Design an enzyme around this catalytic site. Structure first.
Site, PDB file in Angstrom:
ATOM      1  N   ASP A 212      -5.133   3.026  -4.675  1.00  0.00           N
ATOM      2  CA  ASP A 212      -4.544   1.945  -5.503  1.00  0.00           C
ATOM      3  C   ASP A 212      -5.605   1.214  -6.345  1.00  0.00           C
ATOM      4  OD1 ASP A 212      -2.752  -0.562  -6.101  1.00  0.00           O
ATOM      5  OD2 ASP A 212      -1.373   0.723  -4.875  1.00  0.00           O
TER       6      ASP A 212
ATOM      7  N   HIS B 294      -2.487  -5.713  -6.499  1.00  0.00           N
ATOM      8  CA  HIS B 294      -1.468  -4.708  -6.129  1.00  0.00           C
ATOM      9  C   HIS B 294      -1.907  -3.912  -4.898  1.00  0.00           C
ATOM     10  CE1 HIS B 294       0.830  -0.853  -6.729  1.00  0.00           C
ATOM     11  NE2 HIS B 294       1.792  -1.676  -7.078  1.00  0.00           N
TER      12      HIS B 294
ATOM     13  N   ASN C  62      10.182   2.912 -10.468  1.00  0.00           N
ATOM     14  CA  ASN C  62      10.927   1.703 -10.787  1.00  0.00           C
ATOM     15  C   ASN C  62      11.661   1.777 -12.129  1.00  0.00           C
ATOM     16  OD1 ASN C  62       9.733   0.511  -8.396  1.00  0.00           O
ATOM     17  ND2 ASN C  62       7.991  -0.109  -9.608  1.00  0.00           N
TER      18      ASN C  62
ATOM     19  N   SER D 154       6.650   0.482  -4.991  1.00  0.00           N
ATOM     20  CA  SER D 154       5.312   0.232  -4.481  1.00  0.00           C
ATOM     21  C   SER D 154       5.220  -0.516  -3.138  1.00  0.00           C
ATOM     22  CB  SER D 154       4.534  -0.570  -5.495  1.00  0.00           C
ATOM     23  OG  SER D 154       4.186   0.197  -6.617  1.00  0.00           O
TER      24      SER D 154
END
Ligand SMILES: [Ca+2]
Ligand SMILES: [Ca+2]
Length: 279
Positions: A39, A69, A161, A224
């Site tokens: 990430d 994130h 998404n 996520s």
């Protein structure tokens, strides 16, 4: 063990019904398993990791999570207060820049890295990789994710998404890995979650509280956030001896809550990650 007033998604994962607030889990808590969070990085000094996190690789100037994130995702895997697998080992691989963005050649390099690096680490209960990222279809990206899986790492990836069929996104569309959709606290598919035949499982992804940069916390939404619930759950099950990296996704699907979700299009699995814990 029981954590009272837990974030909703941790409760959801140890219950047959929605609306409970306690997370019931075995004390082992993923001890001796390892999860790589591929990430934006992880703020490893955050108190909620208890010294169990570290950065092992960055593809940018610094290994610091300048975004948040990656810290958030890592927190849902294995932070004390916000994590599924509260005693796991977290390793951070920074393939995304501090805007949350990354080239495909770097993401691929990151997955190949984990396949190798795991052989240098002491993870007696197994290895998991959580990939809360994706973009448009790429056969090379899918291929790297397949390689990582066949290496003997349980790979979990975000469905994406776009409120679209996951077949057009990578690594979501690679069949051999565990492609994770998002649900909300009312057992509805998250309005943004991709769907399709390639999805393996759903997990909580709307309004997920977890760790943030600067030693803080925050509640965000997406596929996520669902992916690390599943990655964490895999780690927890492997530590329990219930499954292995090669079959963990299938095991999670076979032991899931079936039919609880609404707004699931025809041809998409209606399965929500469930730990089956019984005191
Ligand atoms: Ca139910
Ligand atoms: Ca799959």
């Amino acid at each position: 063990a029981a954590q009272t007033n837990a974030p909703w998604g941790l409760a959801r994962i140890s219950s047959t019904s929605p609306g409970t607030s306690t997370y019931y889990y075995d004390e082992s808590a993923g001890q001796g398993s390892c999860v790589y969070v591929i990430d934006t990085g992880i703020e490893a000094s955050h108190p909620e990791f208890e010294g169990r996190a570290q950065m092992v690789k960055t593809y940018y100037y610094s290994s610091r999570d300048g975004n948040g994130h990656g810290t958030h995702c890592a927190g849902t895997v294995g932070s004390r207060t916000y994590g599924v697998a509260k005693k796991t080992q977290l390793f951070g691989v920074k393939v995304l820049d501090d805007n949350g963005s990354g080239q495909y050649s770097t993401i691929i390099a990151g997955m190949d890295f984990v396949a190798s690096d795991k052989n240098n680490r002491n993870c007696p209960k197994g290895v998991v990789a959580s990939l809360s990222l994706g973009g448009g279809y790429s056969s090379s990206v899918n291929s790297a994710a397949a390689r990582l899986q066949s290496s003997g790492v349980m790979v979990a990836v975000a469905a994406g998404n776009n409120n679209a069929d996951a077949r057009n996104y990578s690594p979501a569309s690679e069949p051999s890995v565990c492609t994770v959709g998002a649900s909300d606290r009312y057992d509805r598919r998250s309005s943004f979650s991709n769907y399709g035949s390639v999805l393996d499982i759903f997990g909580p992804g709307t309004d997920i509280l977890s760790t943030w940069i600067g030693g803080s916390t925050r509640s965000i939404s997406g596929t996520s956030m669902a992916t690390p619930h599943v990655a964490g759950l895999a780690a927890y099950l492997m530590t329990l001896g219930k499954t292995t990296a090669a079959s963990a996704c299938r095991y999670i699907a076979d032991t899931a809550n079936k039919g609880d979700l609404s707004n699931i299009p025809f041809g998409t699995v209606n399965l929500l990650a469930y730990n089956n814990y019984q005191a």
